[PDB]
Amino acid sequence: KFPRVKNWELGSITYDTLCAQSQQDGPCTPRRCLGSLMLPRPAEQLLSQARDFINQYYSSIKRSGSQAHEERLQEVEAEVASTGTYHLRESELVFGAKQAWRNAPRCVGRIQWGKLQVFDARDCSSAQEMFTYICNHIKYATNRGNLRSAITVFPQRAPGRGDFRIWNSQLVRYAGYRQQDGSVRGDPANVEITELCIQHGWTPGNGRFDVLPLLLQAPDEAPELFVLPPELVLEVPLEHPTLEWFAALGLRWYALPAVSNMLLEIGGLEFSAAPFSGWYMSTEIGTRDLCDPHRYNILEDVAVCMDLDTRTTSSLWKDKAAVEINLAVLHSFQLAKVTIVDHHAATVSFMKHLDNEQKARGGCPADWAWIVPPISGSLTPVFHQEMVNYILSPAFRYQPDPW
Amino acid sequence: GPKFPRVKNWELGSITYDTLCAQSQQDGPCTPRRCLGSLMLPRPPAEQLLSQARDFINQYYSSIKRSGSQAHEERLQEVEAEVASTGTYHLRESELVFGAKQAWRNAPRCVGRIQWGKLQVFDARDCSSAQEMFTYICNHIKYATNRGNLRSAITVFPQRAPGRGDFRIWNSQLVRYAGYRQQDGSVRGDPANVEITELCIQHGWTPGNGRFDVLPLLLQAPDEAPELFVLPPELVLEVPLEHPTLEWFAALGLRWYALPAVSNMLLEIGGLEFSAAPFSGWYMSTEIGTRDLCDPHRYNILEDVAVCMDLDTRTTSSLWKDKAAVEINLAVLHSFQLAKVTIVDHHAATVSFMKHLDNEQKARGGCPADWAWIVPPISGSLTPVFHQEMVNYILSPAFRYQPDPW
Ligand code: HEM
Ligand code: HEM
Ligand SMILES: Cc1cc(N)nc(CCc2cncc(CCc3cc(C)nc(N)c3)c2)c1
Ligand SMILES: Cc1cc(N)nc(CCc2cncc(CCc3cc(C)nc(N)c3)c2)c1
Ligand SMILES: C[C@H](O)[C@H](O)[C@H]1CNc2nc(N)[nH]c(=O)c2N1
Ligand SMILES: C[C@H](O)[C@H](O)[C@H]1CNc2nc(N)[nH]c(=O)c2N1
Ligand SMILES: [Zn+2]
């Protein structure tokens, strides 16, 4: 009933008791494990999710059972009973947001979970206004290369009307232009979103790195187009510490990883537009973004530049180039004074985080296939660390694309 | 639409449904509340045995296309009659061959499964002493090794019997290096093997004092204490390790053995349990180059090599670990190739597993697969399998872990 959890490098053992607080089913059953899938497919119920969350909050500030706690429970009941919904207080929002990060099983950066700047944008009534907040968030989060984790929360969903939505999957993204050749110029991941932008009247560039505009949707209205002022979008040109020719590849990446298509659930309330950012781990750029075959697919190009044997897999040309590319990323970010974390530092701090959460909560939900980096996996301590995965609330969930 | 798990490859954008999972008769460790997929080890009655056997026999008759036939219903009848009077039954020779291969085919954690259909099955169900076990194993090693042109093989000893001790091989692999615990707490040799080494010494082995001493075999026949057997060195092919360009690498004195032969697993077929049934294949380079040589709790040579390579080991962001690891892996491949000893790199191994996935889709409607184990420990997303969703579930016949005999 309580899972024994073992680290195979050190022979140490814990027990996850936290998983007993899961109220939401995952995809696995005793018959088959579906844990490597990316997405598997009343008032009473909101009220009890709301109760639980308010309880989580008052306990977190140690005022559990106090008058303030009782009267807030009553406020919530009064509100659901009359209106079918309720609203969060700003500090409750702040607590839920941090907790949603904390509960995120696919996130290796959770050591930082308590350091999060939260912008309340719930007084937002237009796509225009959404853009102003988005700009402030970017200016703040970027902070001249000295990245600071942030979230911005737009108005919750409501039963009789459409969602506030950011169509873009991240705040900063490079266009992907389908060519005549069936080829793709730019980021292949953003072909569809580039097309949408164009359908809504954007004049498109024709580079491998064109920063895309945002499509912002206020309730029940067409999406609106907003260009980010180049000045707000910090970018880092990639070079390599020893290989002079690398810079000539003209490669570059944006500083700010800001997810914008995920839904934030707090005490049963859903926030369909709640972008959040922190900073990159180098393997995301150096390994996935640049080396995935269905992304920029630069591996072969680099290896030929390195005069490596492409003829055969056994020279490990792929592994050699990947390392250099990840190295280029760390070097370049370090030269441009922009926050980055390599995958050894990140995962060492994740181990520390599992230890903190063991003492603090009796466990930590973690998704092994996501926590382990995409190169050099067993070289990192997370690789040898058994992990239990499950869903706690507050939570970030995936949501369907708005079109 | 389809009432079965949807499985997607994210590189290619293709989709399949696993319908094979419906055949699973045994629960794994996950539940709707929590996924326990990353756990290494998660935590006879006549009717029970009979239904397992009936299922296997049905499986056998399917694979030769005689399902529902007179030979099929007669063999069913012959099996229950046997259980009726003795509480067990026995496999026909060709049933054992089918079941053994099926166990390999069924193994979620093996990336080599495209080779499943090519397995030499040695039937050693006549074996009646620890000495004879030794003989059989020597024959296995000789055949499987084939002077570097490695051949997949398995040797099957007698099955578990009611009120009779098991046949057991104490060593977890037929070929393992000794691990000698030191005065200064550290370990000489392979740390993985401390316990078995200590068990061999207790049982009268005169030990060496190197980093690569081939352990002796501790072999156990029913109701007997285990007997000790030294492998004659001419039988254990090893590859001295060198780098194609870094000339100093050969001076490190590293080596590995050719034949990966697992010896501590239970092979279950139709309820029947084969406690001793060593199987062997050939290595994937990452097993040696990444896991065995670089795990912090094994040989742990990453710092040594990175120093030699003159890397900055004082900071993580030099990726000194990543660089050294690549060269150690390249060294494994290069040296095996040079010695003409079969090996496969993690890129070819994974490509060929994708192909195996497509074969099994067509043939069985799915393929049980443990993502954490199929993905290599270096260069993960550089291999196609990283982007392949996988369904994991237990089919039988199967290989199982079993508790150490001591
Ligand atoms: C502060 C530095 C951070 C680092 C270095 C970091 C690192 C990572 C990495 C490597 C992943 C896997 C990403 C992928 O493969 O696409 C990830 C996922 C995730 N992160 Fe973090 N993260 C950070 C901050 C944050 C913040 C501030 C939040 C929210 C407040 C957050 C929430 C999430 C969530 C919800 C996922 C899962 C995304 C998905 O399922 O697609 N992270 N993070
Ligand atoms: C033909 C060449 C083969 C290759 C390249 C190969 C590769 C591998 C690899 C890399 C592993 C993971 C082991 C680890 O991480 O320590 C593995 C596991 C496994 N292999 Fe294969 N294998 C091969 C042949 C075989 C054969 C002949 C059998 C049995 C007939 C087999 C059955 C298994 C089983 C049962 C596991 C799971 C081990 C465990 O649960 O600890 N393999 N294989
Ligand atoms: C806050 C944060 C920090 C950081 N360093 N990295 C991230 C990762 C962001 C990220 C980038 N690209 C892709 C994804 C996941 C994309 C994704 C994947 C799937 C399966 N469904 C979706 N709806 C979306 C996340 C987030
Ligand atoms: C046939 C075969 C081919 C191949 N290429 N590799 C293998 C490797 C098998 C292997 C190697 N090292 C270690 C293990 C695990 C041993 C092992 C033993 C016990 C009792 N519990 C565990 N969880 C694991 C398995 C086997
Ligand atoms: C199918 C497979 O689970 C999928 O490719 C996952 C694996 N692990 C991952 N891990 C991280 N951090 N990011 C990813 O996108 C993925 N992709
Ligand atoms: C904790 C984790 O499950 C464990 O370290 C697994 C991960 N994947 C693996 N994969 C293989 N092939 N071999 C292993 O020993 C492991 N170890
Ligand atoms: Zn699972």
User: In chain A, what are the domain boundaries?
Assistant: 16-122+149-159+263-277+347-371, 123-148+163-234+398-402, 235-257+280-345
Q: Cα(A39) to centroid of ligand 6, in Å?
A: 23
- The domain made up of B18-125+152-162+266-280+350-374 is a member of CATH 3.90.650.10: no
Please list, in sequence order, all residues whose beta carbon lies within 8 angstroms of the beta carbon of residue A132, skipping any fewer than 6 positions away: none
What are φ and ψ of residue A252, in 5° steps? Answer: -160, 160
CB-hemisphere CA count at 13 Å for A59?
9
- Long-range contacts of the stretch B248-252 (C-beta < 8 A, 24+): B248/B308, B249/B305, B249/B308, B249/B327, B249/B331, B252/B301, B252/B304, B252/B305, B252/B308
Pick the residue whose CA is nearest to atom 14 on ligand 5.
A370
**B138 within ligand 4 shell (Cβ under 6 A):** no
Tell me how far the alpha carbon of residue B340 is from its chain's centroid: 22
DSSP state of A86: -
H or E segment and range at residue A217: strand A214-217
Resolution, given in Å to one decimal, reads 2.5
CA A286 – ligand 3 centroid, Å: 15
Residue B132 and residue B123: Cα distance in Å, rounded? 13
Within a 10 A sphere around the Cβ of B281, how many other Cβ atoms? 22
Domain B126-151+166-237+401-405: which CATH number of 3.40.50.410, 3.90.440.10, 3.30.870.10, 1.10.1040.10: 3.90.440.10
Query: Looking at domain A16-122+149-159+263-277+347-371, which CATH architecture does it have?
Result: Alpha-Beta Complex (3.90)
> How far is B334 from B183, CA to CA, in rounded Å?
36
Shortest CA distance to B325 belongs to which of B299, B301, B296? B301
Q: Is the dihedral of CA A209, A116, B319, A314 positive or negative?
A: negative
Task: Please report how the helices A43-60 and A67-83 are oriented relative to each other, as an axis angle in degrees rounded to 10.
Answer: 160
- Chain-centre distance of CA B130, in angstroms? 23
Question: For residue B278, what are its two tokens?
Answer: 């060593």
Residue type, B215: L
CATH of domain A123-148+163-234+398-402: 3.90.440.10
Distance from CA of A175 to the nearest CA of B (A): 19
Active site residue B364: no
Phi, psi of B58 (to 5 degrees): -55, -45
Q: Are A299 and A287 in contact (CB under 8 A)?
A: no
A363 and chain B: CB distance < 8 Å anywhere?
Answer: no
- Report the C-alpha dihedral over residues A304, A310, A315, A316, rounded to 10 degrees: 70
Residue B390 CB-density burial (10 A; 0-12 exposed, 13-18 middle, 19+ buried): buried
User: CA of A309: how far to CAs of A89, A360, B40, B334, B398, in Å?
Assistant: 61, 51, 37, 14, 41
Residues counted in chain A: 403
Determine which one of B21, B110, B294, B367 is catalytic.
Answer: B110
Task: Name the amino acid, one letter, at B294.
Answer: C
**CA B183, CA B195: separation in Å to the nearest integer?**
16
- Calpha distance B340→A181 (Å, rounded): 44
**Structure obtained using:** X-ray
A370 and A24 Cβ atoms separated by less than 8 Å: no
- Enumerate residues with CB within 5 Å of ligand 7 (an ion): A 28, 33, 35; B 30, 35, 37
Contact A43, A84 (CB under 8 A): yes
Residues B334, B336, B100, B62, Cα dihedral to 10°: 50
Specify which residues A177 forms β-bridges with.
A185
Class of domain A235-257+280-345: alpha beta
Phi and psi at residue A101, to the nearest 5°? -60, -50
| B238-260+283-348: CATH topology | 3.90.1230
Torsion, Cα of B111, B113, B118, B123 (10° steps) = 90
Give the integer Cα–Cα distance in Å for B326 and B91. Answer: 46
DSSP A279: -
Q: Are B149 and B185 in contact (CB under 8 A)?
A: no
Residues B181, B183, B185, CA angle at the centre, nearest 5°? 60
| Under 8 Å between Cβ of A157 and A270 | yes
> Is B126 exposed, middle or buried (CB count within 10 Å of its CB: 0-12, 13-18, 19+)?
exposed
Residue type, A379: L
Q: CB of A112 closer than 6 A to ligand 1?
A: yes
Let me know if B23 is exposed, middle or buried by CB neighbors in 10 A (0-12, 13-18, 19+). Answer: middle
Cβ–Cβ < 8 Å for B37, A105: no
Q: How far apart are CA B225 and CA B367, in angstroms?
A: 41
